[PDB]
Design a protein around this motif. Structure first.
Motif, PDB file in Angstrom:
ATOM      1  N   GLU A 188       3.579  -1.677 -12.039  1.00 30.09           N
ATOM      2  CA  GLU A 188       3.617  -1.902 -10.604  1.00 30.09           C
ATOM      3  C   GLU A 188       2.219  -1.686 -10.022  1.00 30.09           C
ATOM      4  OE1 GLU A 188       6.982  -0.284  -8.254  1.00 30.09           O
ATOM      5  OE2 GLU A 188       5.459   0.882  -7.183  1.00 30.09           O
ATOM      6  N   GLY A 215       8.625 -10.021 -12.405  1.00 26.68           N
ATOM      7  CA  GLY A 215       8.743  -8.598 -12.167  1.00 26.68           C
ATOM      8  C   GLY A 215       9.014  -8.391 -10.698  1.00 26.68           C
ATOM      9  N   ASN A 216       9.016  -7.142 -10.252  1.00 30.89           N
ATOM     10  CA  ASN A 216       9.264  -6.869  -8.848  1.00 30.89           C
ATOM     11  C   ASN A 216       8.136  -7.436  -8.006  1.00 30.89           C
ATOM     12  OD1 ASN A 216      11.686  -5.312  -9.284  1.00 30.89           O
ATOM     13  ND2 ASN A 216      10.374  -3.624  -9.974  1.00 30.89           N
ATOM     14  N   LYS A 217       8.505  -8.115  -6.928  1.00 32.19           N
ATOM     15  CA  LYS A 217       7.533  -8.703  -6.024  1.00 32.19           C
ATOM     16  C   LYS A 217       6.514  -7.633  -5.626  1.00 32.19           C
ATOM     17  CE  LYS A 217       7.365 -11.507  -1.789  1.00 32.19           C
ATOM     18  NZ  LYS A 217       8.165 -12.458  -0.962  1.00 32.19           N
ATOM     19  N   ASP A 226       3.928  -5.234  -3.859  1.00 28.49           N
ATOM     20  CA  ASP A 226       3.940  -4.715  -2.495  1.00 28.49           C
ATOM     21  C   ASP A 226       2.831  -5.298  -1.632  1.00 28.49           C
ATOM     22  OD1 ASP A 226       5.747  -2.719  -3.771  1.00 28.49           O
ATOM     23  OD2 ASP A 226       5.434  -1.634  -1.879  1.00 28.49           O
TER      24      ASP A 226
END
Lengths: 166, 162
Positions: B34, B57-59, B61
């Motif tokens: 991240e 993956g997670n967008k 931030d």
């Protein structure tokens, strides 16, 4: 989506029994009995063995070449050297796995982004599209034979696949 | 080079006079934490170009409005698009040969195998700039992007091989 891992023992044996025919992976993500029987009838008419992720009542027309599974290791199956085609509803993830592994597909768009996802694969010559509600057994059989036996489909999906591995 | 899907073409066209950048680190990035994804997104957000990033993956931030994420991309069709200005790559051989073919300069972010050597090979010809994945700051990545996109020499040098 990732390297193909070994399949469960019973599944590998089933896949191996397809010999030079190879296998097809079918996953649409409780349809009418009429629909399920139309699909089962088409699948029974191809020489390939079929692994169908399905959780409804067993179709009366299920062929001896087709097995129903409540769950399947989709990525590992798509990555198996015996896999010839993927019949899918067009989910984004399923399509990526097919691309990653270079498996041509028969797209049966159901909801949301699925219609578009399959529309693009078709434009690329990597898939054939059919309508879930109106397709007849011969319609589906039509699409299956096209994707499995017309080498242009495998080649077009392989174009998208190669760029994924270096 | 074939037609891009509707939405993608529209996004590319929306770049107007700035053009676009194609960003892909391959199918296996076991180091994209991240923290690294945010450092990268922050750098990408600062250039005027639109960015197409193959990311799973997670967008992040810090994703910029100029950046879009895709699970996979039609890399060859993008590199061959008139609007394309640069290719940020991990340095896999096939992608590099594609970039050379279309005359697209590169920012190399090598991770393993022959990647470091492939990027050094392009630098030797003045067609790329390298950044180190594990220590790079957003500013380091931005500085590299600016050089490859704005200094005419990189484009000229890759065109010579093309």
């Amino acid at each position: 989506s990732n390297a193909a891992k070994p399949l469960p023992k019973e599944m590998e044996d089933f896949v191996q029994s397809s010999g030079e025919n190879g296998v097809v992976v079918f996953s649409l993500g409780n349809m009418t009995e009429e629909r399920a029987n139309v699909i089962a009838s088409a699948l029974a008419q191809i020489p390939q063995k079929v692994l169908w992720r399905f959780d409804g009542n067993k179709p009366d027309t299920l062929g001896l070449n087709t097995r129903l599974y409540k769950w399947i290791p989709q990525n590992d199956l798509l990555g198996h050297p015996k896999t010839r085609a993927f019949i899918t509803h067009g989910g984004a993830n399923g399509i990526y796995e097919a691309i990653y592994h270079g498996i041509p597909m028969v797209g049966i768009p159901l909801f949301a982004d699925q219609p578009d996802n399959i529309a693009h694969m078709k434009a690329r010559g990597a898939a054939v599209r059919v309508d879930f509600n109106t397709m007849s057994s011969t319609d589906l059989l039509n699409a299956l034979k096209r994707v499995i036996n017309d080498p242009s489909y495998k080649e077009n999906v392989m174009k998208l696949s190669r760029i994924q591995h270096d």
